[PDB]
mmCIF file of C-alpha atoms and ligand atoms in Angstrom:
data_model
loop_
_atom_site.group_PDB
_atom_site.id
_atom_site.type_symbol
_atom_site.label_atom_id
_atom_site.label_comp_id
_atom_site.label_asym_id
_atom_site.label_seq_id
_atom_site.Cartn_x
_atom_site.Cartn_y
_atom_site.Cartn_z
ATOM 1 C CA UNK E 1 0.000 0.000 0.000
ATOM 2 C CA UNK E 2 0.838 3.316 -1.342
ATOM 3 C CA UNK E 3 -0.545 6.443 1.060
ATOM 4 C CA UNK E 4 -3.698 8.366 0.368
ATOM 5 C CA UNK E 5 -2.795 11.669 -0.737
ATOM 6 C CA UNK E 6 -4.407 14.664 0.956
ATOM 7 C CA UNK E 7 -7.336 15.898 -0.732
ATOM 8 C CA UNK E 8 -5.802 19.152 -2.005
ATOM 9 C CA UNK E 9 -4.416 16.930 -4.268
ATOM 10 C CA UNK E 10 -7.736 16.155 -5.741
ATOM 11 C CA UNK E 11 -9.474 18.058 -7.483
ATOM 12 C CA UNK E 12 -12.802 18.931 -7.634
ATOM 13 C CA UNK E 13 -14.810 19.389 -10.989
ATOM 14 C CA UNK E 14 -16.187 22.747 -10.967
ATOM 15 C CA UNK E 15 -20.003 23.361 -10.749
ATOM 16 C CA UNK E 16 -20.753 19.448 -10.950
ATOM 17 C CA UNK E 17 -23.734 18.693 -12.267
ATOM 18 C CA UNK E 18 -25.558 15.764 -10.983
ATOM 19 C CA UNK E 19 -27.949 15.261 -13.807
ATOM 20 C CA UNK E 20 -25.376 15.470 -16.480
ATOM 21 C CA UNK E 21 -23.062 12.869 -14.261
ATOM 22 C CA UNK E 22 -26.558 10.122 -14.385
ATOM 23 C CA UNK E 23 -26.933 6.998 -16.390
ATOM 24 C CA UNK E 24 -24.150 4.731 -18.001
ATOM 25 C CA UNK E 25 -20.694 4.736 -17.599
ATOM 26 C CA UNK E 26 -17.641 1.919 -18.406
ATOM 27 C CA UNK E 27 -14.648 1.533 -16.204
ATOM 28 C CA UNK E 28 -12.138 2.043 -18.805
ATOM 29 C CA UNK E 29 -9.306 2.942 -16.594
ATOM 30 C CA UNK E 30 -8.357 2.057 -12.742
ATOM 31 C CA UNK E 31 -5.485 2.521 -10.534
ATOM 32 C CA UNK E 32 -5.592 1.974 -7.045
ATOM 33 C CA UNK E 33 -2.455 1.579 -4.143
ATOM 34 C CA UNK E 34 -3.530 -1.922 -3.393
ATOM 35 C CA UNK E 35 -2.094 -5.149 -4.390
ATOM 36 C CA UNK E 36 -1.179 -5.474 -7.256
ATOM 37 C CA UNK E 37 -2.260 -8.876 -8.134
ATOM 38 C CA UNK E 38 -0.206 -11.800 -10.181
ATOM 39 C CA UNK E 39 -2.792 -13.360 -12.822
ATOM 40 C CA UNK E 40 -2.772 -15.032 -15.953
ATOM 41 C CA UNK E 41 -6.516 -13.814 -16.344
ATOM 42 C CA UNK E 42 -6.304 -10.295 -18.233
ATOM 43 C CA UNK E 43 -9.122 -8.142 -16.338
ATOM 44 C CA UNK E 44 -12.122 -7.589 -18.305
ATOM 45 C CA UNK E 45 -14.193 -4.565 -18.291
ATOM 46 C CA UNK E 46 -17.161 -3.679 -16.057
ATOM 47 C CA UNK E 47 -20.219 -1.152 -15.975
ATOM 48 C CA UNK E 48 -22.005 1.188 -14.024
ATOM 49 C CA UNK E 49 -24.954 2.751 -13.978
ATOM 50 C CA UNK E 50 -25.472 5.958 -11.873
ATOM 51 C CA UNK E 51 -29.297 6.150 -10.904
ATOM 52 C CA UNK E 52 -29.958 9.790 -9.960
ATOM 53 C CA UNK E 53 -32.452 9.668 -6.577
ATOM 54 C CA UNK E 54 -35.080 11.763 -5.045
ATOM 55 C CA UNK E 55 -33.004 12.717 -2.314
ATOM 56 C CA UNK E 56 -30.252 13.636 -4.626
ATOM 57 C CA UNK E 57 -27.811 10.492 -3.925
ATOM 58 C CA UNK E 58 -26.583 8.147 -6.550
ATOM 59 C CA UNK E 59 -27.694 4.351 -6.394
ATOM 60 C CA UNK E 60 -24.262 2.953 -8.455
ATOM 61 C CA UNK E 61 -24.542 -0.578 -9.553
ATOM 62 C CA UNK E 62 -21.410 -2.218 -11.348
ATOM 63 C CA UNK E 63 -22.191 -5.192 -13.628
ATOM 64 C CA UNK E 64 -19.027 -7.899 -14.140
ATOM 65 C CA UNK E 65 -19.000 -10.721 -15.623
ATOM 66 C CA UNK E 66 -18.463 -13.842 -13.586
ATOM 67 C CA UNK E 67 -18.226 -17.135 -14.154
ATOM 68 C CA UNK E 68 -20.531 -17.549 -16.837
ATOM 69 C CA UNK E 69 -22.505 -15.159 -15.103
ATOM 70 C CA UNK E 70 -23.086 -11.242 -14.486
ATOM 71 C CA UNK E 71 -22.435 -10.330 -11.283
ATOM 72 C CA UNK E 72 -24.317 -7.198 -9.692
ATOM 73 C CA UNK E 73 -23.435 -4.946 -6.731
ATOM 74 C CA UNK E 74 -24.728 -1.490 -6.149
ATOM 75 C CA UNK E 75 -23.789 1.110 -3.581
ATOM 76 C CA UNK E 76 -25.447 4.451 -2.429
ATOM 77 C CA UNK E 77 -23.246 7.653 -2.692
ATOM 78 C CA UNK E 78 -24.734 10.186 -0.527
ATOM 79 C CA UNK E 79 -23.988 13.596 -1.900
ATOM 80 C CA UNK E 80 -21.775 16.208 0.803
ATOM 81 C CA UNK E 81 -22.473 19.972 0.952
ATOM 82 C CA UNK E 82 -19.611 20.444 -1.940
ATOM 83 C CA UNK E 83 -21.209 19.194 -5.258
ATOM 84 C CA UNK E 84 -19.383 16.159 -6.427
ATOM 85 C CA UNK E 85 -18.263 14.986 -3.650
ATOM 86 C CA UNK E 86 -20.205 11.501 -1.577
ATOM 87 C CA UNK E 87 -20.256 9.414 0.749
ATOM 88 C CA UNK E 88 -21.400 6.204 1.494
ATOM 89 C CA UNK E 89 -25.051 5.262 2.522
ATOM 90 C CA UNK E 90 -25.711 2.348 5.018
ATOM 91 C CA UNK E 91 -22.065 2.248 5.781
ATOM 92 C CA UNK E 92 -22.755 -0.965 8.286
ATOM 93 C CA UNK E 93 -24.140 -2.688 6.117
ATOM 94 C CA UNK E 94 -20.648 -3.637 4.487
ATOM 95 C CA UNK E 95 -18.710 -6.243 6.745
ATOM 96 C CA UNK E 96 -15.030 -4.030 7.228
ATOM 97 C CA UNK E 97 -15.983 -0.570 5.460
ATOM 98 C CA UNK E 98 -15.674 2.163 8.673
ATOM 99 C CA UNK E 99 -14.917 5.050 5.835
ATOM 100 C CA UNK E 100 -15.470 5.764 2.309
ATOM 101 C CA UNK E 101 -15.279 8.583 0.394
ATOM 102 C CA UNK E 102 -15.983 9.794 -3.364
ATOM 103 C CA UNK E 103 -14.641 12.935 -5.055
ATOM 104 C CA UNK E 104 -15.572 13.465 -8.749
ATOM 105 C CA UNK E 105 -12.823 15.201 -10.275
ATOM 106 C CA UNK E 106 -13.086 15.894 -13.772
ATOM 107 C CA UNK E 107 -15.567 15.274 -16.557
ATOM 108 C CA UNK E 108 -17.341 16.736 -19.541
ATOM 109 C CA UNK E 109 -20.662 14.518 -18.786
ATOM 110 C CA UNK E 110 -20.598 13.238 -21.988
ATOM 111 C CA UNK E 111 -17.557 11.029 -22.935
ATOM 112 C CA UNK E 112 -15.504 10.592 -19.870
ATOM 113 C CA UNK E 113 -15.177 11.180 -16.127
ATOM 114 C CA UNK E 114 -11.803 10.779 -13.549
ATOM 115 C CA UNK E 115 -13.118 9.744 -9.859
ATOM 116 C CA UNK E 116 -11.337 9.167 -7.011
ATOM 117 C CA UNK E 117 -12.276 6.836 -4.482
ATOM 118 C CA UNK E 118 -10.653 6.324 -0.796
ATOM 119 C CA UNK E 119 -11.418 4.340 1.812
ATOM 120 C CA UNK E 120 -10.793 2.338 5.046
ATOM 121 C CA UNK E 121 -11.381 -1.327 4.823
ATOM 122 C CA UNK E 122 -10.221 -3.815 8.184
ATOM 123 C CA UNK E 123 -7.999 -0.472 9.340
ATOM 124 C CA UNK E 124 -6.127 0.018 6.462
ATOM 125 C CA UNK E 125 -6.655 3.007 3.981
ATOM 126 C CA UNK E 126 -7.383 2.134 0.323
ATOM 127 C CA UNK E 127 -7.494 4.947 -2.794
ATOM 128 C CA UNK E 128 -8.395 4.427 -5.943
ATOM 129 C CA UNK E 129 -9.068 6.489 -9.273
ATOM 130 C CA UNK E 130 -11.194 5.307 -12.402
ATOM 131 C CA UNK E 131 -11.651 6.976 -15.618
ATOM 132 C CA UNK E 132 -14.979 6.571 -16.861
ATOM 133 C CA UNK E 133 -15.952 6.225 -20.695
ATOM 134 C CA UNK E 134 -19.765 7.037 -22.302
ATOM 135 C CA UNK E 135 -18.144 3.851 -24.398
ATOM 136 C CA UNK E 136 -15.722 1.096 -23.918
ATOM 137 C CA UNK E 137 -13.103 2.733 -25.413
ATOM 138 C CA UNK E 138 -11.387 6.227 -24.965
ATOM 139 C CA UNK E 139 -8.972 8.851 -27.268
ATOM 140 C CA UNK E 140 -5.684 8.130 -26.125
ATOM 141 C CA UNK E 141 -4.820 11.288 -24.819
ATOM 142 C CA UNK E 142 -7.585 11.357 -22.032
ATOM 143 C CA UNK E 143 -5.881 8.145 -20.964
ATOM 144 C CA UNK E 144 -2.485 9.457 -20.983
ATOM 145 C CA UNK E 145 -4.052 12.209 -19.152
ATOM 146 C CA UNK E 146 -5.280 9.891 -16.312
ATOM 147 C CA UNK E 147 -2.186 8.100 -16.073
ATOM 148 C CA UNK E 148 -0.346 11.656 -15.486
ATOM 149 C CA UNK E 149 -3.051 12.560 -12.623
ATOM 150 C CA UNK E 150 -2.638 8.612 -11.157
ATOM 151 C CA UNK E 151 1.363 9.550 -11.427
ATOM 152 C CA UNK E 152 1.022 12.841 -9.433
ATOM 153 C CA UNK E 153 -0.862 10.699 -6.641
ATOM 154 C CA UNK E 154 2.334 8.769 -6.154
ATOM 155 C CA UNK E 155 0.736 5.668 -7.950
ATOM 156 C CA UNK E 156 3.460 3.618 -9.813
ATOM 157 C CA UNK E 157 2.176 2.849 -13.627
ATOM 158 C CA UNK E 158 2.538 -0.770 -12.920
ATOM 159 C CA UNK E 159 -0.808 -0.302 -10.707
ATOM 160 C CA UNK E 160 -2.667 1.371 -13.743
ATOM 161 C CA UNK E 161 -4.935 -0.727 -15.219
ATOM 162 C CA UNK E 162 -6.979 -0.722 -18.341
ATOM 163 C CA UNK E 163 -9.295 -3.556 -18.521
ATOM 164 C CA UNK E 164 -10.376 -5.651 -21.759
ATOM 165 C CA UNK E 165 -13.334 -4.444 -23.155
ATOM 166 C CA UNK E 166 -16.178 -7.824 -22.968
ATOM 167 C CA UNK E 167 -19.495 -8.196 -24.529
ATOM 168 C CA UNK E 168 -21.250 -9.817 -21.784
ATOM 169 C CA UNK E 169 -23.349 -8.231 -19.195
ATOM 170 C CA UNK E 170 -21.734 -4.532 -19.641
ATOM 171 C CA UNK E 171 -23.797 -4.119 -22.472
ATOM 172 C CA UNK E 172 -26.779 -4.609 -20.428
HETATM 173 O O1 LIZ J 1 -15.835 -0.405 -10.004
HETATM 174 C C1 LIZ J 1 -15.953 -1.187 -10.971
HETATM 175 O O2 LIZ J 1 -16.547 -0.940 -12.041
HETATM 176 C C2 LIZ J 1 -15.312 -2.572 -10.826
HETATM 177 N N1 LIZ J 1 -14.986 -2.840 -9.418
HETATM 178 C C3 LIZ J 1 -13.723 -3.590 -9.329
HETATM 179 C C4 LIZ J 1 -12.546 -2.621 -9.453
HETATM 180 O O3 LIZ J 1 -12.787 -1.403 -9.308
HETATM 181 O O4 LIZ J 1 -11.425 -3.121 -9.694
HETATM 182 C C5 LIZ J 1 -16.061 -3.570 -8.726
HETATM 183 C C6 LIZ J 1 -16.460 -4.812 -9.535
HETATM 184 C C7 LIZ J 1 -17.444 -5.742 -8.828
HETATM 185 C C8 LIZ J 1 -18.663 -6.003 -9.429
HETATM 186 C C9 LIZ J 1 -19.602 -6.816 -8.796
HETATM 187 C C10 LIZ J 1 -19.350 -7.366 -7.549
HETATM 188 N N2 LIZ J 1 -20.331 -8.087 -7.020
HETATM 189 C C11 LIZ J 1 -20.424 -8.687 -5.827
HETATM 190 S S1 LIZ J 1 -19.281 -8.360 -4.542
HETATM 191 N N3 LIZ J 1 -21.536 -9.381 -5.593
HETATM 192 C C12 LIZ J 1 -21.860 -10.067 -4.335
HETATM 193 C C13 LIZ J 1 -20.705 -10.942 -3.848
HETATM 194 O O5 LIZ J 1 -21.019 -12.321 -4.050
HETATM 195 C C14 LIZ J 1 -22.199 -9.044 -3.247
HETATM 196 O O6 LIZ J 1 -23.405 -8.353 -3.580
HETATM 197 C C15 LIZ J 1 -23.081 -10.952 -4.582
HETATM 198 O O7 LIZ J 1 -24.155 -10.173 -5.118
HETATM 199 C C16 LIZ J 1 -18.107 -7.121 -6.949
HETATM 200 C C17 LIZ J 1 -17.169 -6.323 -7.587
HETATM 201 C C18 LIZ J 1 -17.257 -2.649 -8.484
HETATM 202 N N4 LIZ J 1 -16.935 -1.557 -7.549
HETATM 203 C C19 LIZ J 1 -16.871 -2.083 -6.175
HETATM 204 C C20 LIZ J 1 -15.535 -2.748 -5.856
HETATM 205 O O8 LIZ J 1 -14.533 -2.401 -6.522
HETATM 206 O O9 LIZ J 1 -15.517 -3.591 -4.932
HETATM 207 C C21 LIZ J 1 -17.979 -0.524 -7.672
HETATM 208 C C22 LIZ J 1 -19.301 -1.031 -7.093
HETATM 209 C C23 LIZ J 1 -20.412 0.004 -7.277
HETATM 210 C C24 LIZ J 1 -20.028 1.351 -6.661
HETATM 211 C C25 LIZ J 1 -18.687 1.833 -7.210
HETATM 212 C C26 LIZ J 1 -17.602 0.779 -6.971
HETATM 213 N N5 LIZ J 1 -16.293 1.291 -7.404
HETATM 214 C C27 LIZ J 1 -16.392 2.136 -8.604
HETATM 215 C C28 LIZ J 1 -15.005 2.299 -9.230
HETATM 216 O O10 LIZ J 1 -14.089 1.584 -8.775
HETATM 217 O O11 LIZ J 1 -14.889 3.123 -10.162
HETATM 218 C C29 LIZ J 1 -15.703 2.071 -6.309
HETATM 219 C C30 LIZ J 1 -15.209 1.128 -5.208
HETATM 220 O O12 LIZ J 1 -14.830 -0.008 -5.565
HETATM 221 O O13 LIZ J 1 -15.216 1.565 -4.039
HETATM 222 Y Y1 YT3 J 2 -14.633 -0.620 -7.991
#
């Protein structure tokens, strides 16, 4: 593990706009200070869909594809007082979790998005960032771009991942 960076570090995007920021997004980018995983399984892709609430939180399920099956998981993000930024509803409800926080830091709504994620999970602090695609695959300079920011968070590019684009269940 690699440590959390303060949050003056991260960004915020500017006049977010939660109804711009709704429906579906691919992870076509991650890189977070955790393990780093040996594998001879290439990652595959995964989905989410933001679902816009009532009371102005996010219901985010991610879709992945798992043995021969998809796999579904969705989390509340409880919007702070600073637009864009979350945390997590029903916190108890997830064996380990005792903090977790979201920070949306760039995106222009309609092709991709950079969020960072950090957390504490068994008293240890996890961070994560994921660049978000409208589609499966992005221009090569926005992903350049996130490896830069992931770089000036102290992440190592050996802990940048951009998973395989799938057909199955992300499509959903
Ligand atoms: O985020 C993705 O798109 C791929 N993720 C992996 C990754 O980031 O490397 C997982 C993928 C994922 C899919 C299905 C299941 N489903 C299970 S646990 N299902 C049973 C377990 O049996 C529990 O409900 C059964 O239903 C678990 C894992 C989904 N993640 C949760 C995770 O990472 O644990 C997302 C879940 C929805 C909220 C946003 C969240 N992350 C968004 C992000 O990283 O950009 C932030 C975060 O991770 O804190
Ligand atoms: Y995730």
């Amino acid at each position: 593990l690699i440590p959390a960076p303060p949050l003056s570090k991260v960004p915020l995007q500017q006049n977010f706009q939660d109804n711009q920021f709704h429906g579906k997004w691919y992870q076509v980018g991650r890189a977070g200070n955790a393990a780093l995983r040996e594998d001879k399984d290439p990652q595959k892709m995964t989905a989410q869909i933001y679902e816009l609430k009532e009371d102005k939180s996010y219901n985010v399920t991610a879709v992945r594809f798992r043995k021969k099956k998809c796999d579904y998981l969705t989390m509340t993000f409880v919007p702070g007082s600073q637009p864009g930024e979350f945390t997590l509803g029903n916190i108890k409800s997830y064996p380990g979790l005792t903090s977790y926080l979201v920070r949306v830091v760039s995106t222009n709504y309609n092709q991709h998005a950079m969020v960072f994620f950090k957390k504490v999970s068994q008293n240890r602090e996890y961070f994560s960032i994921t660049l978000l695609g409208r589609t499966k695959e992005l221009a090569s300079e926005l992903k350049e771009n996130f490896i830069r920011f992931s770089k000036s968070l102290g992440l190592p590019e050996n802990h940048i991942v951009f998973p395989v684009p799938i057909d199955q269940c992300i499509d959903g």
